[PDB]
Amino acid sequence: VSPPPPIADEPLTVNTGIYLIESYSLDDCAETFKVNAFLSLSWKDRRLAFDPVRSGVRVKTYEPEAIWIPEIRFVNVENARDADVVDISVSPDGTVQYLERFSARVLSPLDFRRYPFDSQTLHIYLIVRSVDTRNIVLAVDLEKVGKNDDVFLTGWDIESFTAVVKPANFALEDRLESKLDYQLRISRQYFSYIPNIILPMLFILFISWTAFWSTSYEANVTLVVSTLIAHIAFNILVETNCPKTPYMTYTGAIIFMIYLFYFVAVIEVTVQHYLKVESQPARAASITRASRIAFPVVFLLANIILAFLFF
Amino acid sequence: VSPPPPIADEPLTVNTGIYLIESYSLDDCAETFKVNAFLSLSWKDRRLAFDPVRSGVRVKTYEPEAIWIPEIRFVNVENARDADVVDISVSPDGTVQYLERFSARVLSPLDFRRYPFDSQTLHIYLIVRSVDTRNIVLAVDLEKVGKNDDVFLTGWDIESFTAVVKPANFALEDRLESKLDYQLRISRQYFSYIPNIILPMLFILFISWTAFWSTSYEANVTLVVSTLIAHIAFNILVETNCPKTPYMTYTGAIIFMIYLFYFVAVIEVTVQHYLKVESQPARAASITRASRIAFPVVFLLANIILAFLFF
C-alpha cells in the first residue's frame, strides 16, 4: 500500500481504456450527459511478480484492498463516478489488469452556433495526481478504447469514441498531473426539424405576406398581428431553444429575422393605408405590388447570406 | 472466494430468472422505466457439496460474503441496481440457489412511429463476464420467470414478461460475456385519445372550413388565422409529443398535414377575395364552392393514405 518502486528514474505508466456500455440523458440545456462504461487500468508492480510453476496459477486475483491501485479521477464530472470493481488480475511479471464498471454525469460544453445541423465532441477527462515517492503518467491502450454497438442517443448519430493518446502533463499544487482526453463524436439527426419546426414556421410567415394582395387595412392588421401571435405561440410549442444561449446561433438569427419581417410587413401595411387615405392610391398600390416580390426575395437572399456566414 | 472448478473443461452455467413485483415510472421522453423485481440465480459448486446423512440439514444457508457468487450485471441500466439478498440456499450436490430483490431504472428505446396505437418491447439485459480460471454462461429457468398479477403501467396493457432462452455469447475486452434478453411486452390504451386529443383538434380545423360558406374577407381572415392560433394553443395544452422525435411519427404526419391545410385554406381565402376585388365573382364563387368538397375529401383521402402507410 505504497506506489511500486522505480527501476531507474522513470515515472509509472498507467495504461487506461474506456469502453462505453451505455450513453444516455444528453441534456442540451445543462451541457451534461450521463455515461455507463468500463474503465480498464494497467500498470506494473514488480512486488507482485511470481513464478507460475511454484504457484501453479498462470494468473493471480486480488481484492482492491490487498494491492496498490492508482487514484484515477475524472476532471469534468458533477460528483465522483459510481464505481464497481469487476476484476483485478496479476500476471507472473507483476502486470495488473484492473477493470471496473462506472456511471458518471459528465459536464461537456456544447456549441449551438450551427443547430440543428451541429456536430459535437463530448469530452471525458481522466486524471492522476503524482505521489511523493514517484511520478504517475497516463497512457492510452487503444485496444481497450471502444463502445457497444447498441450505444445510442436519441436524435444523434454517434460517429466515434476515441482518445487523444498524448496526455497533458502539467504541474498543479507542486505535483504532476497527467490528463487524458476521451472524445465522443456525435452529429445531430435534423430530418424531422423541417416538417416539425421550419415548414410550419414558414407557413405562418407566408400567411402574413397575403396582406400584399389586400387593400383592407382591418383585414391586413388582423393578418400581420395575428400571425405574429401564432409565430410566438408556435415557438412556445416547439421550444427549439434552451434558456437563451449567450451567443448568436444560426436558428437564433433566422428567428430574429422573422421578427424583423413581421415589423417591416406592419410598416408596409401602415404606409399603404396612410397613402390610400391621404388621396395617393397610385403610390400605395405600387409599394404593395413591389412588396409581393421584395418580401420573398429579400427573405430568400438574407437566408442564403446567413447560411453562408454560419456554414 | 474463487470460482467453482470444472469437472472436465465445461463452462459454468448460471441459471437465471426475473420475477416482476412492480413496474412503474415509464417515461416516454427519457425512454426509461423503473422496475422492482426478484432475481434468482442457480449454479453448481461442488466445494459446497455435502453428504446429508453426516450433516443432518435439508439445505445449508450462507451469507453472501461466505461463498463465491457470480457477478451478474445489467447492461441497459442508468446506475447499478439496488439489490437486497433475500436468500442463499445450498443443496447436498452443491447447487446454490440465490435470490435477491432489486430495483433499477432501465433504459429501453421506444418506437413512436405508430403512436398512440403503438406496442413496445421493453428490454432487460442480464450479463456475466467470464473469469480467469473458467468461462461463465447464462441460462433461463422458465419456472422462475414471471410477473405479479397486479403489475401495471397506467395507459398500457402488459401483455407478457418472457426471456429469450438462448444467450448472446461474445468476446469483450479479451473475455467471454454471456448476455440474456428479458422482454416486457406492452401495448398502449388509446381510447381517451379520440375524445381528448383527436376530436377537439378536428373541430378547430372544421371551424376553419366554414370560410367556404362566406364571402366576407375580414370574417374569413379571422376564421382561418384565429383557428390556427386555437390549434397551436390546443397542441400546447395536450402536449402529445415529447421533445421532437428524430423520425416521422403517424401523429406527427397528421399534425404536419393540419398545418398545411391551414396554409392552403389561407391561399383559397386570399385567391377568392382577390378575384372578387378584381371584378371576377364567377371564378371566386366556383373556387369556394369546389373547396367545400375538395377540403374534406382531400383530408379524408390523405388520412387514409397515411393510416395505410403507417399500419
Place this chain on the structure above:
Amino acid sequence: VSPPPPIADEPLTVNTGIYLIESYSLDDCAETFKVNAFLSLSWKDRRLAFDPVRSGVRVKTYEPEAIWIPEIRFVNVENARDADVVDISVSPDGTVQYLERFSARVLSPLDFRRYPFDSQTLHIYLIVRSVDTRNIVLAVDLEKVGKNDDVFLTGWDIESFTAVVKPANFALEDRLESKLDYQLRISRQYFSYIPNIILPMLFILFISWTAFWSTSYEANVTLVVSTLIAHIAFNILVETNCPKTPYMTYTGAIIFMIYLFYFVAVIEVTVQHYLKVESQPARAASITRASRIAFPVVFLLANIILAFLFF
C-alpha cells in the same frame, strides 16, 4: 442468525403495526405518495430467553446485527424504505419487540373517474418470505396500527388508516409469502374547484352564447372563435388534468362536451349567416331565437345525464 426453531411444526407469527407520523407528496400524475411512519414487529425467539434475576434487567436491548430479525419488505415501493431502528426489546420469554422509523415512496393506483369529487384507498403492502427451516406468517397488532392526528395531505380529508387483519398467504418461487394490506382512505376537498375552475370556464362558454343575440357575422365569428381560444388558454392556466388519463373521467366528459358546444355554436353562426345572405332572414332569425333556449337547455340536460352516469 438463523430463524427461531418451532416448538411443534407451527409457523412463526410476526405481529406487525404501522403508525403514520407524516403523509406527504401525493402525486396524482405519478400515482405515488411519500410516507413517514413507525413499523413495529413482534415475534418469539426462545433462544433469546433469559432469567431477569441472573441478568438483573427485566428487559434486554439488542443491536439489529446481534439477533435474528425477519426480513419484512414492502411490495409497492419505488426503492427499499429508508429505515432507522428505534428500539429492539427482548422480554424473559424470548419475545422480541422491534420498532423502526421509516420513510418510503409508495406506488398506489388512483381512480380519477369521479374527480374532483373522488375518494381514494392508498395501499401499503407488507410482505415476508418464508425460509428453509420454517414458514413465516404476518399478523396485525391493532393496538400498534394508527396515525398521528396532525397527519395531512393538502386538498384531502384523511378518513382512516387501517389494515386488513387476514394476510394473503400464497406460494411464490417455491416458498410461502405472507402479505398484509394497510389502507389509507382519503377523500378530495373539492370546494375551491367551483370558483377557480368550473365557474370561469362556464363564463367563457356563456360569452360564446351572446352570438345568439347578434346578426353581425364578423362579431359572431370573433365571439365564438376568440372564446374558444380563451377556453383553451384557461385550461393551460388551470392545468386540471395530469398527462392524459387512459380512461374517460367525469371532468374529461364535461370538457369534451364544452369543445363540442363551441363547434355547434360555430355551425349555428355559419347557418344563420348563410340563410341571411341567401335571402332567407325568416329561417335565420327562427334558428338564432331557438338556439337562445336550445343551447342552455341541452347543456344543463347533458350535464345532468353525465352527473347521473358517473355518480
Place this chain on the structure above:
Amino acid sequence: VSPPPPIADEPLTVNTGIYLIESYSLDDCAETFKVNAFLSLSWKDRRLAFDPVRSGVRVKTYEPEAIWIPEIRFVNVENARDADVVDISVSPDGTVQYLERFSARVLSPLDFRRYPFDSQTLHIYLIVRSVDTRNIVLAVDLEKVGKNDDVFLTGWDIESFTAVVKPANFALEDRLESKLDYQLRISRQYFSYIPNIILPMLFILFISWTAFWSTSYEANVTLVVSTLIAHIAFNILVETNCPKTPYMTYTGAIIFMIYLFYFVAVIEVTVQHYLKVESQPARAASITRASRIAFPVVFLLANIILAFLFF
C-alpha cells in the same frame, strides 16, 4: 450502553437547542423548506462523572460509539436528517454536551389565505421516545436557540427563530414521547407584487372598460374578449398561484371577481347592442353611461369588502 440510571424515579431531561446556519429552498407548492443547522443536546450521565485532579483534564472528549446518546428524531421531515457529530464534551459531574450539524427537508403547512400579505410560522418538531428503564423528556436551552444573521429566504423577512419551551408529552404505542416545537416566523416581501402582478392585471381590466365609451359592437367584442385572453395569458405568465389551493385565498377571490367582471362587461356590451338594433338607443346610451361609473365603483367597493373579510 444503556440509559443513565435515575437518582430517585425522575425522568431524564435532554436540554435541546437548534441554531440555524442556513435556510433555503422554501417551496410554497410542496409546503416544504430545507434547513441547515446545529443541534445541541445536553443531559447528565453520572456513570461518566470524573475527578478533574486524578484525570488531569477539566473536560473529556468521547466518540459517539463510546457513550449512551439519546435518540432524537424530527417529526415533520421527509427522510431522517443528514447529521455530522461536531463535538461531544463531558464535564466532571457527568454533564454531556453533544453538538451535531444537520441538514433536513422540513414539511410545514402554509396558509395562503392572505397571500401576498401573508406571514407564516415554519415548524421543526423535535421528538424523543422513552425506554423501559426510564422516561426521557425534552427541554429548551434558550441560550442554544438562535439563527445566523446572514440566514435568508428570498422574498421573505425572517422575524424570529424560537421554541415553545413546554414540551408536548404524550403516550404512543405504550411509551412516553416528549415533543418540542421550534418556530421560524417569516413574513412575505410583497413590494414588487404591485408593479409586477396587480398593476398590469388592473390595466387589462381597465382596457375592457373603454367599451363603455364606444357604440361599435365589433370593437366592443374585440375589447372585452381580447382583454379576457390577455388576462388569462398574463396569469399563465406571472403564475401567482401554485397547483390549485383547496381553500379560497384573498388573491383567489380578486381573480374570481375579475372573471365575473369580464362576464358582466360582455352582458352590458350585448344588452347595449341589442337595444340599439331593437330601435331603443335612449335605453342603450343610458346603460353604457351608468356602466362608466357602476363598473369602477362596484369593483372598488367589492375589493374593500374582500380586503375587510380577509384582513
Place this chain on the structure above:
Amino acid sequence: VSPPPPIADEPLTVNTGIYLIESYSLDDCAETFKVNAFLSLSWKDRRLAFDPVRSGVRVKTYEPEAIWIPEIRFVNVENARDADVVDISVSPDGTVQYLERFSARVLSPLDFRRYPFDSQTLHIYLIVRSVDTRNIVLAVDLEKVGKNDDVFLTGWDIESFTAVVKPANFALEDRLESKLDYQLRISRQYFSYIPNIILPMLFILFISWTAFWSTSYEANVTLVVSTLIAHIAFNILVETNCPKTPYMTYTGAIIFMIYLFYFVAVIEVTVQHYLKVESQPARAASITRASRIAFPVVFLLANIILAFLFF
C-alpha cells in the same frame, strides 16, 4: 486522535486553499451553484515530527484515520460536501499537508437589480470550530488558491477566484469559530440579450404605435390589444425573469413601463375615437399627431432616466 498540543498557549493555524477544477449548474432562481474543487489544508502537529535519517523517508504518508485532522466545514452549503481525500503528507518537522477533492452545491445570494448587465460575487465560506484543549484559527495559503483555466459558466465571464486572507473570528455556542471568505467574481456575458429579448419586444411595442397613423377605431383596438397579447405571449416564450424577485430590477422597470405604455396607447385610441364620434375631429387629429412624437420621445426619455437610476 486529540488536537496537537500548543508549545506556549498559541492557537492552531490551519492554512487553507481552494483550487476550482469545475464550476457548473449556476441556478439564478435557486441562488445556488455547483462546484468541484481541491481543498488543501496545512497545520503543525509535532507528535508527527520524525528524523528522516532513522526513518529513511523525506516525507511520510498517512491514512485519515491514523492522524488528527481538523474538522473544516462549509457554512453556505445545501448538504455537507462529497469529499475524497487525495493525499496526506507529513514532513520531518511535523507539518501536515492534507489534500482532498470535493463537490458541493453552494448557496450564494444574487443581486438582479442590474440584470442582464450584472456582476456577481459568489461566496464559499470555510469554517472551523475550536476544541476543548485548544483554539483553531484559519489562514489563507495564496500559493494554494486558484482555478483551472478551462473553468466556465455558460453566459458568464469568470473574472477571479480569491480569498479574503483575514478570517472572521467570532463566538458561536460558547466556542470560538474562525471563518474564511472565498470569492468567485463573475460578470454576465449576454451578447444576445438585445436581439433575442429586447428588439422583438420593442418591435411589438412599435407596432402598437402605428395606431397613431390610423383613424379606424376597429383597426386601432386590434392593433393595441393584439400587440399586448403578443407582448405577454413573447414574455411567456423568453421567460427572462425567475419566479418574481422581491425587489425592483432594471429589466423589471422597463417591462412595467411597457405595460403602462400599452395602457396609455389604449387611452389615446379611446379619446381620439370619442372626440371623432362627438363631432370634434380637430381635437382628435391634433392628439393623434402629438402622440406620434410624444410616445417615442417619452419612451426614449424614461429609458434614459431608468438606465441612469440603475447604473
